[PDB]
Design a protein around this ligand. Structure first.
Ligand SMILES: CCC(=O)Nc1nc(C)cs1
Lengths: 412, 412
């Protein structure tokens, strides 16, 4: 048998705000965090908008000297991790520090730092590359820096599974606790790829909305006028905790993490299969992991990226998995508001799924003005929907055909 | 309930050879694969040598059309994966494809692709960025492309934990099989960071040997004249397999993977503590995991990077863990010959550890002419030592104080 895993702490930077309760207020009001990107010449670029983190103050977390050494994606990781640990009330001691680990990941990592260090390498040669370039940019330094600052000696690692990183990080953090390798983990992801290489990289693949005239309307999952996803920045982080350990110290428990699914499409590098067979296997694996029958699911936080092929495959997968229950469950895409935080997408959407359990409300899919062929499920168009939710799914489907599903259940 | 995990396949690219056997003959013969780098102009760099993969033909594995769009780390990752799966004699069917996953990792990833597309972006503009830039560069696409080529629909992910990547990838892939998430995993890592950003970034942090005039003598772990690590490129992949699944198909079994440890130093972003405290925690967890008396350990394949601080911390860690038995076991650094393949160090060194069990031989530490203060263990200076090896242990340490230990033993 296996230990049960609860959420005792949550932390976040999104395009909707600098913490969870502000972000969530935005989610439930159907606000967009999408706007033209500032302080950057995007003239030669086909996309000029995204979800930026607005008014982030890194000195709330770090000295100016330590923040200077660290990619924006690491600063966002640390902010969310610190918020989450503080949200948990957890106290690290000599007695427990070896039982507390970190799995914070990122899809794309330190592009902003790689751009600046390239600028210097090409203009001036290697001798202007920063000393802190490697340790200030590599993806495992959110885990590394947080572990050093808080004295965490538990499992210390980072995942990079593109747009599935946050979901994988949280699920495999939960595995560490359930099989007794740790009692507490800080898990999620962070991303800042609304930079030249991010917008250029994804623009070159024509993966991005080019709807520059109405940036708030660009992200329209399942709408017949969608034209690709919206690149967004930020971080999610949860404190996962073994249930007995949480009860003993009198922790506030948001929800129980009951199920983790993984699967590979083994199909295509960027495109899912049309029937979502991989997402369907993953969701089944997640429900079996939880010992739940598909009928018990009430809410799904879709991947719902606003790509033609991606949005339709998720409908196919849900119909397949859930048969005569696929219309009963509510399924929204909060990317309609936040855009796609890539590796951080799963972290922030896990939090939104937890808070849909707390508040008994399905968040909206905004911009779903004209559902496409076959998109006839309860996609919670335009407006939040209060309803009964005992069990919430959060899905993530990534490049390389890598899939992740988390199942959260109400704790009482 | 926890299942046993054996090695049925291995595959490799190293500075010593284009596969495992040719690599291994180099290891046993004490050959260096370190040489001035020929593939670029490094006259403006303080380090102008490393461990290149020599004569690599990607068209032994992939069509030119696919290879062109993939970073060398990914080509190297697939070449090792393909070798390993072929060497396992495993056949992939509808019966088993859902039970076969992949976790191939990288510390630094697609830095050549990211540098070249950065060059394109600043000299020309976003219109010259390759459409294949993201899928052909991000770290999780070794696992992705492998899954697409072989039809592996099991758990699909990648770790990025710097110089620990390969050990963590292998260990967590065994935890997948152990806990029943998969029956087979292809796990390891790949690296190709020998570009301007790679040599420059590590050069700017003053971490690299500058012994440009004698590159074969540069990597000298525990020698008093060591002056930094040597940067090397390549790939290690292993087929991990549940024991009864291996027995059921008459798999040839190289050895059993009995033990995995992780720990955080929670000390420093780049420097190990002088006492080897987090390395000691990590080996103690690994040994307890394997249910072993620490006197059972015959051979340690050390991290052994040829840094002043890293090398001595290891002696301390080993002495602290093994007490007087620290004088009986043999410890060596194959990095004396391969140099440091970073996130792939853990993968090729796991294979070296398994081959040390099969051929009953401790590979040498070359260039160990004058061992440093405290470095008084059997470090297998100069020449391979034939000796009894039932239990072999492979250590890795990384930036962010992230530690990994694997324990292998002979299987009969
Ligand atoms: C190491 C992180 C990484 O691969 N990031 C990438 N971003 C792009 C846009 C391509 S590869």
């Amino acid at each position: 048998s296996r230990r049960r895993v609860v959420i005792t702490g949550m932390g976040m930077l999104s395009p909707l705000g600098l913490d969870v309760p502000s972000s969530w207020e935005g989610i439930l009001a159907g606000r967009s965090g999408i706007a033209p990107i500032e302080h950057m010449d995007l003239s030669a670029y086909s996309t000029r908008f995204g979800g930026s983190v607005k008014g982030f103050n890194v000195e709330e977390y770090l000295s100016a000297k330590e923040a200077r050494k660290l990619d924006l994606f690491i600063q966002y990781g640390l902010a969310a991790s610190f918020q989450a640990v503080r949200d948990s009330g957890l106290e690290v001691t000599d007695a427990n520090r070896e039982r507390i680990g970190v799995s914070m990941g990122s899809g794309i990592g330190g592009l902003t730092n790689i751009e600046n260090n390239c600028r210097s390498l090409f203009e001036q040669g290697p001798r202007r590359i920063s000393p802190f370039f490697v340790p200030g940019s590599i993806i495992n330094m959110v885990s590394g820096f947080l572990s050093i600052h808080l004295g965490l000696q538990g499992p210390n690692y980072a995942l990079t599974t593109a747009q599935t990183t946050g979901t994988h990080s949280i699920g495999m953090a939960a595995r560490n606790i359930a099989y007794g390798e740790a009692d507490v983990m800080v898990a999620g992801g962070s991303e800042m790829a609304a930079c030249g290489l991010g917008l250029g990289g994804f623009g070159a693949a024509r993966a991005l909305s080019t709807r520059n005239d109405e940036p708030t309307r660009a992200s329209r999952p399942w709408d017949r006028d969608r034209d690709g996803f919206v690149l967004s920045d930020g971080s999610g982080a949860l404190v996962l905790e073994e249930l007995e350990h949480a009860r003993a110290r009198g922790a506030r428990i948001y929800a129980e993490l009951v199920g983790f699914g993984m699967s590979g499409d083994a199909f295509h590098m960027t495109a899912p299969p049309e029937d979502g067979a991989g997402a369907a296997r993953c969701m089944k694996n997640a429900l079996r992991d939880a010992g739940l029958d598909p009928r018990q699911v009430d809410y799904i936080n879709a991947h719902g990226t606003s790509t033609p092929a991606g949005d339709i495959a998720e409908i196919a997968a849900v119909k397949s998995v859930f048969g005569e229950h696929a219309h009963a469950l509510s399924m929204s895409s909060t990317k309609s508001m936040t855009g796609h935080l890539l590796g951080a997408a799963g972290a922030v959407e896990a939090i939104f799924s937890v808070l849909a359990l707390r508040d008994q409300v399905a968040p909206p899919t905004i911009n779903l003005d004209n559902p496409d062929e076959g998109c006839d499920l309860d996609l919670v168009a335009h407006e939040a929907k209060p309803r009964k939710i005992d069990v919430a799914l959060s899905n993530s489907f990534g490049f390389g055909g890598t899939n992740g599903t988390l199942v959260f259940r109400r704790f009482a």
